Ligand binder design. Structure first.
Ligand code: HEM
Ligand SMILES: C[C@@H](O)CC[C@@H](C)O
Length: 396
């Protein structure tokens, strides 16, 4: 049934977990909403708003005061279990915890990690090259972010195979494993690292965040658990999705493979343009004050779902948004791939470096590649949309 403050003409049944046609094209599936009202109420998933036009997505995402990050998701209970830091915090509390995390991920540290992260991408590329084909999502995209994670926290080289296998439960969620079991599995995986780095700080990512104060006092052990869980989960599916979309683009645009092999100096600019072009992250908020938007009122307690694709790819917000082009002069902060305002991805710098290093190694090390002739590209929806299969072929 429809709440009184929701006009009948704003009602849709859009399921954010499986948008119609999402398996063929995630972007086209979401863009169907640009043909309707800029703020719609879906009856699916318990009933919630969906921001459905660029200016609305952008405005509501940035309103951290009236639209709280506490809820995490439209699925009940998920946020209550995960308690991510800083992702789910508001206001002064959020600022106090974000501060040391952002310090940990600053550009100087990202730049210092570039050679190690490049070596990880190169090693993985070289393991696949002799085959002449791969299932890129399962053989590369879903493998790289966990390998990078182990590098970021500097695990001993000899523990990597064990730690890589332990990690597979978390990079590729299965079921029936409940949210509580997944939280517990993540914590148990992370605990030995945290214990070591809080006792004996090194110079890795965890050590550097955990040796900083929060609001002038030490991290508690539970806050460390919550923050570390956020760092692990925040960099896994998002990076896998983006790397897959970048590879899919190149496979479909042999002219861009040729361009970036001829002009490797265009890789950074191509990484920024591809990140703008293929956003797949959507977020939830819960209203803590009434919010007027697009001629309706989101009431306290209502949930709001915000798809970044409907800012970046809305022709009303950006000109010819589906063209990959180099004359936009657009700082990455001006689009919504990494979010907006107070909660904007702390890993934004690191993600850009990972995509650049991927392009350098894949293009530099691989011959010309293409989609397989008889297998399809499939995608999925949910909060982080992604390729589920990407079959590539090349002459080895
Ligand atoms: C392609 C890569 C990535 C994309 C597209 C992405 C996207 C996003 C977006 C949209 C947000 C804002 C969420 C919101 O407003 O509720 C965010 C926040 C965040 N991301 Fe990322 N991210 C990526 C990579 C990473 C990496 C590599 C890490 C860390 C290893 C990371 C960790 C975080 C954390 C901790 C937050 C919470 C920041 C806060 O609440 O203040 N992300 N990310
Ligand atoms: C929880 C989901 O909607 C967003 C998670 C990204 C921001 O890491």
């Amino acid at each position: 049934m429809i709440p009184a403050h929701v006009p009948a003409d704003r009602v849709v049944d859009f399921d954010i977990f499986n948008p119609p046609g999402v398996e063929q094209d995630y972007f086209a599936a979401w863009k169907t909403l640009l043909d309707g009202p800029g703020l719609v109420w879906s009856t699916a998933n318990g009933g919630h708003w969906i921001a459905a036009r660029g200016d609305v997505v952008r405005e509501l995402w940035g309103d951290a005061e009236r639209l709280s990050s506490q809820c995490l998701a439209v699925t009940p209970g998920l946020g209550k279990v995960m308690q991510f830091i800083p992702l789910q915090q508001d206001g002064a509390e959020h600022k106090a915890f974000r501060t040391p995390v952002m310090k940990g991920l600053a550009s100087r540290f990202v730049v210092a990690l570039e050679p190690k992260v490049q070596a990880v991408a190169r090693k993985l590329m070289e393991s696949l090259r002799p085959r002449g084909s791969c299932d890129f999502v399962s053989d590369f995209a879903e493998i790289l972010p966990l390998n990078i994670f182990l590098t970021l926290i500097d695990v001993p080289l000899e523990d990597r195979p064990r730690l890589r296998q332990l990690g597979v439960q978390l990079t590729r969620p299965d079921g029936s494993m409940t949210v509580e079991q997944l939280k517990q599995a993540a914590d148990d995986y992370l605990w030995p690292f945290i214990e070591k780095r809080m006792a004996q700080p090194g110079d890795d990512l965890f050590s550097r965040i955990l040796s900083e104060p929060v609001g002038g006092r030490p991290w508690t052990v539970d806050e460390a658990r919550r923050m570390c869980r956020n760092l692990l989960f925040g960099g896994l599916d998002t990076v896998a999705a983006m790397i897959g979309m970048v590879a899919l683009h190149l496979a479909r645009h042999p002219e861009d493979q040729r361009l970036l092999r001829e002009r490797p100096d265009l890789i950074p600019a191509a990484a920024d343009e591809l990140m703008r072009r293929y956003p797949t992250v959507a977020v939830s908020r819960n209203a803590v004050a009434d919010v007027d938007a697009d001629g309706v009122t989101i009431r306290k307690g209502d949930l709001v779902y915000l798809p970044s694709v409907l800012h970046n790819l809305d022709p009303a917000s950006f000109e010819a948004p589906e063209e990959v082009r180099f004359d936009r002069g657009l700082a990455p902060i001006r689009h919504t791939t990494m979010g907006v305002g107070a909660h904007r991805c702390v890993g934004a710098g690191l993600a850009r470096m990972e995509v650049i290093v991927f392009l350098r190694e894949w293009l530099g090390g691989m011959p010309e590649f293409a989609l397989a002739p008889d297998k399809a590209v499939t995608m999925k929806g949910g909060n982080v949309g992604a390729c589920t299969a990407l079959p590539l072929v090349w002459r080895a």
